[PDB]
Design a protein around this ligand. Sequence first.
Ligand code: MG
Ligand code: MG
Ligand code: MG
Ligand code: MG
Ligand code: MG
Ligand code: MG
Ligand code: MG
Ligand code: MG
Ligand code: MG
Ligand code: MG
Lengths: 90, 199, 67, 80
Amino acid sequence: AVKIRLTRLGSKRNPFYRIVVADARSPRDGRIIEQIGTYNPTSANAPEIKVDEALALKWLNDGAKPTDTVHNILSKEGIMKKFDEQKKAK
Amino acid sequence: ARFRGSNWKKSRRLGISLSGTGKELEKRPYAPGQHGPNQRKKLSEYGLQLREKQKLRYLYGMTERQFRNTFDIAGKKFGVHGENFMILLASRLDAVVYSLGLARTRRQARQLVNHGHILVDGKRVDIPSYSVKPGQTISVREKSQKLNIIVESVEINNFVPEYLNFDADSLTGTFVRLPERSELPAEINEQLIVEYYSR
Amino acid sequence: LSNNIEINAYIPGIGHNLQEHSVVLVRGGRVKDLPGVRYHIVRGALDTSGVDGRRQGRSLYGTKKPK
Amino acid sequence: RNDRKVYVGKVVSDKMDKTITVLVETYKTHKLYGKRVKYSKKYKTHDENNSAKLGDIVKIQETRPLSATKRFRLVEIVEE
RNA sequence: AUGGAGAGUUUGAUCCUGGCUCAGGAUGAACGCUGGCGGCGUGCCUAAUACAUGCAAGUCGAGCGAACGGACGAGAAGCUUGCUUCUCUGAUGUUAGCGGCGGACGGGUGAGUAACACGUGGAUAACCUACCUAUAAGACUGGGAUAACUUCGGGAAACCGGAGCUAAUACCGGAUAAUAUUUUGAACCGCAUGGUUCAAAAGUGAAAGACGGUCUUGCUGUCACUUAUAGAUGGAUCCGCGCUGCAUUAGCUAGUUGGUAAGGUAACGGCUUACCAAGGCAACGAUGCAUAGCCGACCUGAGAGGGUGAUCGGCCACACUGGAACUGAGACACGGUCCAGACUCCUACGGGAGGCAGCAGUAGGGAAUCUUCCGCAAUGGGCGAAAGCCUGACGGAGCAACGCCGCGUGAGUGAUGAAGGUCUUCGGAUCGUAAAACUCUGUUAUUAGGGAAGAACAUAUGUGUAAGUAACUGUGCACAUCUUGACGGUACCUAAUCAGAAAGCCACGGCUAACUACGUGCCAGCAGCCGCGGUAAUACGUAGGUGGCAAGCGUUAUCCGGAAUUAUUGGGCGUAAAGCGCGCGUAGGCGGUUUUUUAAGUCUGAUGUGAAAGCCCACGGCUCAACCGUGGAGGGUCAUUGGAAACUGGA
Ligand SMILES: [Mg+2]
Ligand SMILES: [Mg+2]
Ligand SMILES: [Mg+2]
Ligand SMILES: [Mg+2]
Ligand SMILES: [Mg+2]
Ligand SMILES: [Mg+2]
Ligand SMILES: [Mg+2]
Ligand SMILES: [Mg+2]
Ligand SMILES: [Mg+2]
Ligand SMILES: [Mg+2]
């Protein structure tokens, strides 16, 4: 189905990722529905994470499902709690 | 370095002392080789443009590819192209080290940077082509503080340009600001070089 | 040629080893003196030997470095 | 509701049954020279009552495919 | 204002016209000579030729029967209490088969396609959509089989046939349940057809369990199941406009154009079929022929333009050739099926087997294009509750100066201008501060130690919290803990030793930077053009010297430039190429003055959109750069909507 996942960029031995909403059948570095953020694993010994809460929450509401690393990111940024809180509150 | 040929022959051909002292031009101020002593026919307009370009290139000991790339990036900046090219040439770690006076020769300064003796902002920079920007501090590696070459060069109180600020006690220089055309070599007519690269 | 077109190719350099049934590499370039010759034989490629004793512009005539 | 495209043209054929052919004239600027050149397209249109006649200005709106070639219907007759 | 160079060659000389040629940039390049390293890329363009071999798609025991394995541990003493059997229990496990899901993705290629294929902008009151999310309502009551298995039989084989037996979240009946279907009331609404909403009947349509918790003659957690309605996603159709050469291709079409009715499709529709009519298309290029995947982009150019469509991303098409359907949410399906054909292979001659335009690799073709590698550690995908398994996707490694960028092959001092080579006016001059000598350095190299990031996790294990419950287990969420790296002991770092191992290529008459000697003598040869060479060649070949570049330098091929030589920007037609021999005129192009009006062109805004990557600009990260990342800017002949009205158009 619809998935929030990391698309690989950068160069050899220098990964950079864009956090994107994509259909699963889509190729990893191919067609996407929307980009929500970025993730840099190799940056300054601290993962650098940019995410749009408004976009991430809209997609999580509509049934988009994170890959495991993306879930960790949305947890680190606090989006996964917000999703739960609203959903329980609903 | 990269070009490792006779610096005198190159000076004599180009009618300019690459060492900046005139030692090459003192005895034989004419082109090298068999026909050097004989009269030289007048240079064409292309000949003059090429001569001026080669003068600047051999002065900074750069290869043509790199020289042309530097000319391009200089052109992309704001202001007068020729002047921007010359200040950008002067901003090379090579040139900065030489002008600070950590070496007595440009080739020596290049070997110093290339062999990893030099520090920029406390960290090792080994690329002679490195483009030093204003505010950066050039230093000597802690191990190399007592090199005979460096100490002797610094002892010889070479004039340090105004855009730099050297402390001989600490062997630490500072790239204070961008050079000015006044501070840059006066024997170069950069306009000819711009014209050369136009055609 | 391999495309089956018959052409006249110039043989450059001083001296050649080529005979009928030799296999050769042909490049572009016409000889102005010779009317029908619109191609050159490449020296030092396939059967064609390099010019012997060529010591200047050897790459053009397929000669290895003398040393 | 989203709006379907509407065109105005002159009826050039009324021979077919419940159908009129409408010639819509537009200008295509030349890519290089920049002069506008008159261009015409005949649009096959549905005229249920066979109301329109050759030489009458008509207003046509886009529809679902009504035939092999017919994609438009007659909204009104502007002039006769 | 950021951006624009010319030169040679028609003559005795000249000005002009005019073609030809060159200096530049670019490449998936190839070839010749030569060759140190690193980073980041790129690498069958030709035969959509044929393909040996391994691998590229599985997974699920928490759907199911069955089989294997049989722990822990049951009995007798062979007097061997360490070895024994079936008279048992039989745990963690494992698998062939059934069933579910996946296999329609990912990966490859560009043959076909001149087309709504694609690009851009719209439409669907003519559509469809597994998994995912949300909400609501349910999951009741029965049945008959069949793999595996057992046995028999037929085949060379591939693989079939009979009998018997057996499960399921397999299959089937009935019940109950629709906004679905029919019919009848309304109400409101749009853009023809029509949309929407609310009532009253009629016919008709579902489902399923598994693994756990508990207070266990009954509740419940998670997952699975069914129906209805939305969302999300993906797909389908239609249309405006844009998108290719040839008229020495001018006519083309009969399901053809339209209508009617019926059938058919998710769906509109000649989509199809009967019937009726004669339409439809075309000089605004139909039809035919040739060629071609299209685009984002890419190369060049001051620009306007011109050329191109590798790598990467999007869309399309194809899967030995041709046809067809089946299964399914989705295929008319690269590693599915059936048939025909060609080819290859096996055979007991009866009959069988197969499809690298997946990754490697081979043969062939070609000027020319890589290893039959490592790992699922990362990212992504399938299956599973999950661990996990599968993954030639992908991450890495290998090979190749193929490209781009970076750094080397030493540095300082050095007249005593040594020797030697070359030239010479025999004075000398040049190679040449070059060398040697002396001093110094270690990029690199070599050797020896240290040694990253990339890793997030998932799971499991605690604690808390939220919803729900009688409560619990679970579930979501939050915070802790252990553990996981192919590359790889790689990058990088440190120390020690050593100038030692690390420069070639083309050119030097002019364009065009750089000349002499000797040999040769219209020969041998050179050559992009002007040309050069027939005895004192800066043009041949070699040598010395020089010039231009540099791990490259040259050559060839091809594209843009210069070429204002198709000229919109930006040329011409008396004599240079060029005014139809001349009328009458059709289409078309163009058109006097004023006022009023309109607003199609024009001008000025707003809104949506013109993917990402790229180009450009800025900033940040890699020791620098290349490269990587991020944010802007730009790119329409775009659509929609609001103004202005001089000019063009309309009235
Ligand atoms: Mg083709
Ligand atoms: Mg131009
Ligand atoms: Mg398949
Ligand atoms: Mg296959
Ligand atoms: Mg280089
Ligand atoms: Mg030659
Ligand atoms: Mg032109
Ligand atoms: Mg004439
Ligand atoms: Mg006349
Ligand atoms: Mg973009």
